[PDB]
Short mmCIF file of C-alpha atoms in Angstrom, two decimals:
data_model
loop_
_atom_site.label_atom_id
_atom_site.label_comp_id
_atom_site.label_asym_id
_atom_site.label_seq_id
_atom_site.Cartn_x
_atom_site.Cartn_y
_atom_site.Cartn_z
CA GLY A 12 3.58 -36.76 160.21
CA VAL A 13 2.07 -33.75 158.37
CA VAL A 14 0.98 -30.80 160.58
CA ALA A 15 -0.43 -27.44 159.40
CA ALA A 16 -1.99 -24.51 161.15
CA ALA A 17 -3.21 -21.04 160.38
CA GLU A 18 -3.96 -18.29 162.89
CA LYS A 19 -5.97 -15.15 161.95
CA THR A 20 -7.34 -12.43 164.10
CA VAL A 21 -21.59 17.40 155.57
CA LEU A 22 -23.93 18.76 152.87
CA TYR A 23 -23.31 16.15 150.18
CA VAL A 24 -25.36 18.20 147.71
CA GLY A 25 -24.60 16.34 144.69
CA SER A 26 -22.27 13.92 146.38
CA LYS A 27 -21.69 10.50 144.66
CA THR A 28 -24.06 10.44 141.68
CA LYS A 29 -23.35 8.11 138.81
CA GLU A 30 -25.46 9.01 135.78
CA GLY A 31 -25.36 8.72 132.04
CA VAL A 32 -23.28 5.73 132.59
CA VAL A 33 -22.92 2.25 131.02
CA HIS A 34 -20.73 -0.39 132.57
CA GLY A 35 -20.22 -4.16 132.59
CA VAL A 36 -21.35 -5.10 129.13
CA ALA A 37 -20.21 -8.31 127.46
CA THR A 38 -21.40 -8.47 123.89
CA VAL A 39 -20.84 -11.29 121.24
CA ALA A 40 -21.97 -10.48 117.68
CA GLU A 41 -20.82 -13.39 115.66
CA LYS A 42 -21.85 -12.79 112.19
CA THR A 43 -24.04 -9.77 111.32
CA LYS A 44 -23.54 -8.85 107.71
CA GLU A 45 -24.66 -5.25 107.68
CA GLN A 46 -25.35 -4.01 104.18
CA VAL A 47 -26.60 -0.50 104.49
CA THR A 48 -27.48 0.90 101.02
CA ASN A 49 -28.44 4.55 101.57
CA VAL A 50 -29.42 6.97 98.92
CA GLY A 51 -30.54 10.53 99.71
CA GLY A 52 -31.07 10.17 103.49
CA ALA A 53 -29.75 9.65 106.97
CA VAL A 54 -28.99 6.23 108.48
CA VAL A 55 -27.57 5.24 111.93
CA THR A 56 -26.78 1.69 113.03
CA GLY A 57 -24.76 -0.24 115.58
CA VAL A 58 -24.62 2.06 118.65
CA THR A 59 -23.49 0.01 121.53
CA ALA A 60 -22.34 1.03 125.03
CA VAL A 61 -22.69 4.73 124.67
CA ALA A 62 -23.12 7.50 127.30
CA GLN A 63 -23.83 11.17 127.16
CA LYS A 64 -24.96 13.93 129.74
CA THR A 65 -25.79 17.59 128.87
CA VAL A 66 -26.63 20.68 130.89
CA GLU A 67 -28.55 23.48 129.16
CA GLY A 68 -28.59 21.85 125.78
CA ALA A 69 -30.50 19.43 123.48
CA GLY A 70 -28.83 16.12 123.10
CA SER A 71 -29.65 13.11 120.94
CA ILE A 72 -27.74 9.89 121.36
CA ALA A 73 -28.50 8.17 118.10
CA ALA A 74 -31.07 10.35 116.19
CA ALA A 75 -32.00 9.77 112.49
CA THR A 76 -32.95 13.38 111.97
CA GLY A 77 -33.44 13.36 108.37
CA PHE A 78 -34.02 16.60 106.45
CA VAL A 79 -34.53 20.23 106.86
CA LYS A 80 -35.87 22.47 104.03
CA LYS A 81 -36.70 26.17 103.81
CA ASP A 82 -37.54 28.20 100.77
CA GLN A 83 -38.49 31.83 100.66
CA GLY B 154 8.00 -34.69 159.78
CA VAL B 155 6.43 -31.74 158.05
CA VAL B 156 5.28 -28.76 160.00
CA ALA B 157 4.01 -25.29 158.79
CA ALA B 158 2.41 -22.51 160.56
CA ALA B 159 1.11 -19.00 159.70
CA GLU B 160 0.43 -16.30 162.19
CA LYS B 161 -1.62 -13.16 161.21
CA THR B 162 -2.99 -10.30 163.24
CA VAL B 163 -17.26 19.29 154.32
CA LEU B 164 -19.63 20.57 151.60
CA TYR B 165 -18.98 18.01 148.95
CA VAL B 166 -21.07 19.97 146.51
CA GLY B 167 -20.25 18.03 143.34
CA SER B 168 -17.98 15.66 145.15
CA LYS B 169 -17.42 12.24 143.49
CA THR B 170 -19.70 12.14 140.55
CA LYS B 171 -19.02 9.81 137.72
CA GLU B 172 -21.08 10.56 134.68
CA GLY B 173 -21.06 10.36 130.88
CA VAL B 174 -18.84 7.29 131.58
CA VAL B 175 -18.50 3.77 129.94
CA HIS B 176 -16.28 1.16 131.63
CA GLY B 177 -15.84 -2.54 131.61
CA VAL B 178 -16.95 -3.63 128.17
CA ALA B 179 -15.74 -6.86 126.49
CA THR B 180 -16.89 -7.00 122.93
CA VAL B 181 -16.31 -9.73 120.40
CA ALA B 182 -17.39 -9.00 116.91
CA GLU B 183 -16.18 -12.05 114.89
CA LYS B 184 -17.37 -11.52 111.26
CA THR B 185 -19.46 -8.43 110.41
CA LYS B 186 -19.07 -7.61 106.75
CA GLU B 187 -20.05 -3.95 106.66
CA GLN B 188 -20.75 -2.87 103.12
CA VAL B 189 -22.05 0.77 103.35
CA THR B 190 -22.87 2.08 99.98
CA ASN B 191 -23.93 5.64 100.48
CA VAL B 192 -24.96 8.15 97.78
CA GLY B 193 -25.95 11.76 98.46
CA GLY B 194 -26.59 11.29 102.33
CA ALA B 195 -25.27 10.83 105.85
CA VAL B 196 -24.49 7.48 107.41
CA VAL B 197 -22.98 6.59 110.89
CA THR B 198 -22.32 3.04 112.00
CA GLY B 199 -20.23 1.13 114.60
CA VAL B 200 -20.13 3.45 117.53
CA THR B 201 -19.03 1.44 120.60
CA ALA B 202 -17.78 2.46 124.13
CA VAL B 203 -18.24 6.18 123.65
CA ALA B 204 -18.72 9.04 126.13
CA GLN B 205 -19.50 12.78 125.94
CA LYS B 206 -20.50 15.47 128.53
CA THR B 207 -21.43 19.00 127.60
CA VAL B 208 -22.22 22.24 129.51
CA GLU B 209 -24.23 25.00 127.84
CA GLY B 210 -24.25 23.30 124.46
CA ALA B 211 -26.10 20.89 122.17
CA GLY B 212 -24.49 17.57 121.86
CA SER B 213 -25.23 14.56 119.79
CA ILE B 214 -23.26 11.21 120.15
CA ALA B 215 -24.02 9.58 116.84
CA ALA B 216 -26.53 11.71 114.95
CA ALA B 217 -27.48 11.03 111.27
CA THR B 218 -28.40 14.65 110.69
CA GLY B 219 -28.97 14.55 107.03
CA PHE B 220 -29.51 17.81 105.22
CA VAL B 221 -30.06 21.52 105.51
CA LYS B 222 -31.36 23.61 102.63
CA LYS B 223 -32.22 27.27 102.39
CA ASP B 224 -33.09 29.26 99.30
CA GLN B 225 -34.08 32.86 99.09
CA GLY C 226 12.30 -32.72 159.25
CA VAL C 227 10.85 -29.72 157.43
CA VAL C 228 9.74 -26.69 159.39
CA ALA C 229 8.33 -23.35 158.08
CA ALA C 230 6.76 -20.50 159.83
CA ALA C 231 5.44 -16.95 159.01
CA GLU C 232 4.71 -14.18 161.44
CA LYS C 233 2.72 -11.11 160.32
CA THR C 234 1.24 -8.28 162.39
CA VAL C 235 -12.91 21.24 152.97
CA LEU C 236 -15.43 22.42 150.19
CA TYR C 237 -14.66 19.79 147.52
CA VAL C 238 -16.86 21.77 145.13
CA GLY C 239 -15.93 19.75 142.01
CA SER C 240 -13.65 17.45 143.85
CA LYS C 241 -13.07 14.00 142.19
CA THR C 242 -15.29 13.88 139.20
CA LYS C 243 -14.59 11.46 136.40
CA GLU C 244 -16.70 12.25 133.33
CA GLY C 245 -16.56 11.82 129.65
CA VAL C 246 -14.49 8.86 130.25
CA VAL C 247 -14.05 5.38 128.86
CA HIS C 248 -11.88 2.81 130.53
CA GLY C 249 -11.54 -1.01 130.49
CA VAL C 250 -12.48 -1.97 127.06
CA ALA C 251 -11.26 -5.28 125.46
CA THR C 252 -12.58 -5.47 121.90
CA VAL C 253 -11.80 -8.28 119.45
CA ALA C 254 -12.92 -7.66 115.82
CA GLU C 255 -11.71 -10.74 113.90
CA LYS C 256 -12.87 -10.12 110.32
CA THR C 257 -15.00 -7.19 109.47
CA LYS C 258 -14.42 -6.36 105.70
CA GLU C 259 -15.48 -2.70 105.65
CA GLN C 260 -16.23 -1.57 102.07
CA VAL C 261 -17.50 2.02 102.28
CA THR C 262 -18.34 3.25 98.73
CA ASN C 263 -19.40 6.88 99.30
CA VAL C 264 -20.38 9.29 96.47
CA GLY C 265 -21.33 12.86 97.26
CA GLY C 266 -22.02 12.49 100.94
CA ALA C 267 -20.78 12.19 104.51
CA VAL C 268 -19.92 8.77 106.15
CA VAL C 269 -18.57 7.82 109.65
CA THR C 270 -17.73 4.32 110.80
CA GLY C 271 -15.77 2.57 113.44
CA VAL C 272 -15.74 4.90 116.38
CA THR C 273 -14.59 2.95 119.45
CA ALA C 274 -13.37 4.02 122.98
CA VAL C 275 -13.90 7.66 122.36
CA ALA C 276 -14.29 10.63 124.87
CA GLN C 277 -15.07 14.38 124.71
CA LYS C 278 -16.12 17.05 127.10
CA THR C 279 -16.98 20.64 126.18
CA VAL C 280 -17.87 23.75 128.18
CA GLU C 281 -19.77 26.54 126.30
CA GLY C 282 -19.80 24.79 122.99
CA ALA C 283 -21.69 22.37 120.87
CA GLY C 284 -20.05 19.02 120.52
CA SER C 285 -20.82 15.98 118.39
CA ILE C 286 -18.83 12.64 118.86
CA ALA C 287 -19.55 10.99 115.63
CA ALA C 288 -22.07 13.01 113.63
CA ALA C 289 -22.92 12.38 110.04
CA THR C 290 -23.82 15.94 109.35
CA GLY C 291 -24.45 15.87 105.69
CA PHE C 292 -25.04 19.01 103.78
CA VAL C 293 -25.59 22.76 104.12
CA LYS C 294 -26.90 24.81 101.17
CA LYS C 295 -27.81 28.50 100.89
CA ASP C 296 -28.56 30.42 97.69
CA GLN C 297 -29.48 34.13 97.49
CA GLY D 95 -32.44 19.04 91.47
CA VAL D 96 -31.16 15.80 93.26
CA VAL D 97 -30.77 12.63 91.41
CA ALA D 98 -29.38 9.28 92.46
CA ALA D 99 -29.47 5.84 90.88
CA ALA D 100 -28.09 2.37 91.64
CA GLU D 101 -27.89 -0.49 89.17
CA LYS D 102 -27.14 -4.04 90.46
CA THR D 103 -27.15 -7.39 88.58
CA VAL D 104 -16.62 -38.50 97.64
CA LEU D 105 -16.78 -40.66 100.84
CA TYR D 106 -16.83 -37.87 103.50
CA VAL D 107 -16.21 -40.48 106.14
CA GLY D 108 -15.72 -38.25 108.96
CA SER D 109 -16.16 -35.07 106.85
CA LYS D 110 -17.18 -31.87 108.69
CA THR D 111 -17.74 -32.98 112.29
CA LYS D 112 -17.54 -30.19 115.05
CA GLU D 113 -17.55 -31.86 118.42
CA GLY D 114 -16.39 -31.26 121.97
CA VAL D 115 -16.72 -27.56 121.00
CA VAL D 116 -17.97 -24.46 122.81
CA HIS D 117 -18.59 -21.14 120.82
CA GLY D 118 -20.52 -17.97 121.28
CA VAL D 119 -20.56 -17.34 125.10
CA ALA D 120 -21.01 -14.00 126.55
CA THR D 121 -20.75 -14.11 130.41
CA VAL D 122 -20.86 -11.30 132.86
CA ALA D 123 -20.11 -12.21 136.38
CA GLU D 124 -20.22 -8.93 138.33
CA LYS D 125 -19.41 -9.66 141.92
CA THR D 126 -18.88 -13.25 143.05
CA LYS D 127 -16.69 -13.26 146.12
CA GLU D 128 -15.22 -16.88 146.04
CA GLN D 129 -13.82 -17.74 149.36
CA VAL D 130 -12.69 -21.43 149.15
CA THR D 131 -11.33 -22.59 152.39
CA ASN D 132 -10.15 -26.10 151.70
CA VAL D 133 -8.45 -28.38 154.35
CA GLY D 134 -7.31 -31.94 153.44
CA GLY D 135 -9.33 -32.39 150.19
CA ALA D 136 -9.93 -31.72 146.60
CA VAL D 137 -11.96 -28.63 145.32
CA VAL D 138 -12.73 -27.43 141.69
CA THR D 139 -14.66 -24.29 141.03
CA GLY D 140 -15.33 -21.89 138.00
CA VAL D 141 -14.80 -23.90 134.96
CA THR D 142 -16.43 -21.92 132.02
CA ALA D 143 -16.15 -22.27 128.26
CA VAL D 144 -14.12 -25.54 128.27
CA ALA D 145 -13.66 -28.34 125.84
CA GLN D 146 -12.02 -31.69 125.62
CA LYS D 147 -12.00 -34.69 123.19
CA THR D 148 -10.19 -38.04 123.81
CA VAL D 149 -9.71 -41.31 121.92
CA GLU D 150 -8.80 -44.36 123.78
CA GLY D 151 -8.56 -42.81 127.17
CA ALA D 152 -10.51 -41.72 130.33
CA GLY D 153 -11.17 -38.12 130.48
CA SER D 154 -12.90 -35.88 133.08
CA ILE D 155 -13.60 -32.28 132.56
CA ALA D 156 -13.80 -31.01 136.00
CA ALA D 157 -13.73 -33.93 138.50
CA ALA D 158 -13.37 -33.55 142.24
CA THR D 159 -11.70 -37.01 142.57
CA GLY D 160 -10.85 -36.89 146.18
CA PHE D 161 -8.73 -39.63 147.67
CA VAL D 162 -7.06 -42.94 147.02
CA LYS D 163 -5.70 -45.06 149.84
CA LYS D 164 -4.11 -48.49 149.80
CA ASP D 165 -2.35 -50.29 152.67
CA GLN D 166 -0.81 -53.70 152.65
CA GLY E 219 -27.82 20.07 90.04
CA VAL E 220 -26.43 17.02 91.88
CA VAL E 221 -26.25 13.72 89.98
CA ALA E 222 -24.82 10.39 91.21
CA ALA E 223 -24.76 6.91 89.73
CA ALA E 224 -23.48 3.48 90.50
CA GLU E 225 -23.22 0.51 88.14
CA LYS E 226 -22.55 -3.00 89.32
CA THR E 227 -22.61 -6.35 87.55
CA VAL E 228 -12.20 -37.32 97.10
CA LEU E 229 -12.13 -39.49 100.23
CA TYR E 230 -12.25 -36.68 102.83
CA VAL E 231 -11.81 -39.28 105.53
CA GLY E 232 -11.19 -36.87 108.39
CA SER E 233 -11.58 -33.79 106.30
CA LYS E 234 -12.55 -30.60 108.03
CA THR E 235 -13.18 -31.56 111.64
CA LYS E 236 -13.09 -28.83 114.30
CA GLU E 237 -13.01 -30.41 117.75
CA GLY E 238 -11.83 -29.72 121.28
CA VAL E 239 -12.31 -26.09 120.29
CA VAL E 240 -13.48 -22.80 122.00
CA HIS E 241 -14.04 -19.75 120.09
CA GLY E 242 -15.86 -16.43 120.44
CA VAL E 243 -16.00 -15.80 124.18
CA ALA E 244 -16.55 -12.44 125.68
CA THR E 245 -16.15 -12.49 129.50
CA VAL E 246 -16.40 -9.63 131.92
CA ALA E 247 -15.66 -10.55 135.40
CA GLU E 248 -15.85 -7.24 137.35
CA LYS E 249 -15.00 -8.03 141.01
CA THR E 250 -14.42 -11.43 142.08
CA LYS E 251 -12.27 -11.51 145.19
CA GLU E 252 -10.87 -14.96 145.11
CA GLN E 253 -9.43 -15.93 148.49
CA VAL E 254 -8.27 -19.44 148.35
CA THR E 255 -6.85 -20.67 151.62
CA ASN E 256 -5.71 -24.22 151.06
CA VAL E 257 -4.04 -26.44 153.52
CA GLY E 258 -2.97 -30.10 152.76
CA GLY E 259 -5.02 -30.62 149.59
CA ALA E 260 -5.60 -29.77 145.93
CA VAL E 261 -7.59 -26.78 144.60
CA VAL E 262 -8.26 -25.61 141.05
CA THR E 263 -10.23 -22.46 140.19
CA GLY E 264 -10.84 -20.10 137.26
CA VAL E 265 -10.37 -22.24 134.15
CA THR E 266 -11.89 -20.31 131.23
CA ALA E 267 -11.71 -20.85 127.48
CA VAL E 268 -9.65 -24.03 127.57
CA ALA E 269 -9.15 -26.77 125.02
CA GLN E 270 -7.44 -30.25 124.98
CA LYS E 271 -7.53 -33.21 122.65
CA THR E 272 -5.72 -36.53 123.37
CA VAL E 273 -5.22 -39.71 121.39
CA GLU E 274 -4.33 -42.95 123.33
CA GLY E 275 -4.19 -41.28 126.67
CA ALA E 276 -6.10 -40.22 129.79
CA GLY E 277 -6.72 -36.51 129.86
CA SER E 278 -8.41 -34.31 132.50
CA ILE E 279 -9.01 -30.54 131.84
CA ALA E 280 -9.36 -29.25 135.38
CA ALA E 281 -9.27 -32.24 137.84
CA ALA E 282 -9.01 -31.94 141.60
CA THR E 283 -7.32 -35.26 141.99
CA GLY E 284 -6.50 -35.09 145.62
CA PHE E 285 -4.32 -37.74 147.08
CA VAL E 286 -2.70 -41.15 146.52
CA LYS E 287 -1.42 -43.21 149.33
CA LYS E 288 0.29 -46.61 149.37
CA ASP E 289 2.06 -48.24 152.31
CA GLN E 290 3.57 -51.79 152.34
CA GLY F 132 -23.41 21.04 88.78
CA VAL F 133 -22.04 18.05 90.60
CA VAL F 134 -21.87 14.61 88.79
CA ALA F 135 -20.24 11.37 90.13
CA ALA F 136 -20.29 7.91 88.63
CA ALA F 137 -18.96 4.54 89.39
CA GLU F 138 -18.66 1.64 87.02
CA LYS F 139 -17.96 -1.99 88.34
CA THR F 140 -17.99 -5.39 86.64
CA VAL F 141 -7.39 -36.02 96.57
CA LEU F 142 -7.37 -38.16 99.78
CA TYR F 143 -7.50 -35.42 102.38
CA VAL F 144 -6.94 -37.98 105.13
CA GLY F 145 -6.46 -35.52 107.85
CA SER F 146 -6.84 -32.39 105.75
CA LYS F 147 -7.87 -29.22 107.48
CA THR F 148 -8.47 -30.22 111.09
CA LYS F 149 -8.44 -27.45 113.70
CA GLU F 150 -8.47 -28.93 117.19
CA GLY F 151 -7.23 -28.16 120.70
CA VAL F 152 -7.72 -24.59 119.64
CA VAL F 153 -8.92 -21.44 121.33
CA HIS F 154 -9.62 -18.24 119.27
CA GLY F 155 -11.42 -15.04 119.68
CA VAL F 156 -11.53 -14.39 123.31
CA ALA F 157 -11.96 -10.91 124.85
CA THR F 158 -11.84 -11.00 128.61
CA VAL F 159 -11.95 -8.05 131.00
CA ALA F 160 -11.24 -8.90 134.64
CA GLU F 161 -11.48 -5.57 136.43
CA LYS F 162 -10.69 -6.21 139.96
CA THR F 163 -10.05 -9.75 141.22
CA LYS F 164 -7.92 -9.68 144.30
CA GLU F 165 -6.52 -13.15 144.30
CA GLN F 166 -5.11 -14.03 147.76
CA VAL F 167 -3.88 -17.59 147.63
CA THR F 168 -2.55 -18.78 150.95
CA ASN F 169 -1.34 -22.30 150.48
CA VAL F 170 0.40 -24.43 153.02
CA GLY F 171 1.43 -28.14 152.17
CA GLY F 172 -0.48 -28.57 149.01
CA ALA F 173 -1.13 -27.89 145.33
CA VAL F 174 -3.09 -24.89 143.97
CA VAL F 175 -3.91 -23.84 140.40
CA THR F 176 -5.70 -20.71 139.48
CA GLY F 177 -6.43 -18.38 136.60
CA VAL F 178 -5.94 -20.51 133.38
CA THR F 179 -7.43 -18.65 130.51
CA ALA F 180 -7.17 -19.23 126.82
CA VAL F 181 -5.05 -22.36 126.94
CA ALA F 182 -4.61 -25.17 124.50
CA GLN F 183 -2.92 -28.63 124.35
CA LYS F 184 -2.89 -31.70 122.09
CA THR F 185 -1.10 -34.94 122.89
CA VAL F 186 -0.57 -38.21 120.96
CA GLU F 187 0.39 -41.34 122.91
CA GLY F 188 0.50 -39.63 126.29
CA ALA F 189 -1.45 -38.55 129.29
CA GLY F 190 -2.21 -34.82 129.45
CA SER F 191 -3.76 -32.60 132.01
CA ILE F 192 -4.55 -28.89 131.28
CA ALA F 193 -4.85 -27.61 134.80
CA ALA F 194 -4.80 -30.52 137.33
CA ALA F 195 -4.53 -30.05 141.07
CA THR F 196 -2.85 -33.44 141.48
CA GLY F 197 -2.05 -33.23 145.09
CA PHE F 198 0.11 -35.87 146.68
CA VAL F 199 1.88 -39.29 146.03
CA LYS F 200 3.21 -41.22 149.00
CA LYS F 201 4.93 -44.66 149.11
CA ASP F 202 6.52 -46.34 152.02
CA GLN F 203 8.07 -49.81 152.20
#
């Protein structure tokens, strides 16, 4: 004889604001042979799961902003 | 004889704001042979799970901002 | 005979704000042979699980900001 | 003046046999509320990325093999 | 004047056999509230990244093999 | 004047057999509230990154093998 029993019985102006956010990312990269041969320049690779937030400014997440030149 | 029993019985201006955030990232990178041969330049690689937040400024997460030149 | 029994019975201006944050990151990098041969330049690699927050300033997480030159 | 240069110049009976194998699986399960209320039975749930290989035997990966009864 | 330069110049019966193997698995499970209320039975949950290999035997990875009964 | 330079110039019966193996597993489980209320039974949960290999035997990785009964 086996017997079992269970018996159970306000302005919020910017309030909850989730932004510039990255969450829940599962990334497998098995074999990526990255051979980056750069001469005289700018290179950006492999930016994953990145966040930024600015106020009163100029923001670039991954910018290949190559050259400035000025002669006078 | 086996017997078992269980018996159970306000302005919030910026209040809860999650931003410039990265959470919950599972990343396997098995074999990435990174051979970065740079000559005379800027290179950025491999930026993962990164966060920034600025106020009154200019912010770049991963920027390949190569060169400035000025002659007078 | 086996018997068992269990018997159970306010302005908040910036209040709780989580930002420029990184949490909960599980990262396996098995074999990444990083051979970084740099000559005359700037290189950045391998920035993982990084955070920054500025106020009244200019902030770059991983910036390859290569060169400045000025002649007069 | 900026100058840069780069200069580059036997039976095998069971030999390499990959079997009963699982590789390269990226799985996000955000919110699965698993409420498994079992009474008097067998239940199996949530078998992911599993492998088995037998020789001279009887193998079940995830088998809900409920009951045997014998009276004499 | 900036100058840079780089200058570069046998039976194998069971030989290499990868089996009953699991590799390279990135798994995020954010919120799975597992409430397993079992009474008088067998339950199995949450088997991830598991391996087995047998020889001359009977093998079950995750088997809900409920009951045996014999009366005489 | 900036100058830089770089100058570079047999039976194998069971030989290399990787089996019953688990490698390279990145697993984030943020919030899994596991409430396992068992009465009179067998329960198994949460088996991750597990390996076994037998020879001349009967092996179960995670088996909910509930009950045996024999009366005479």
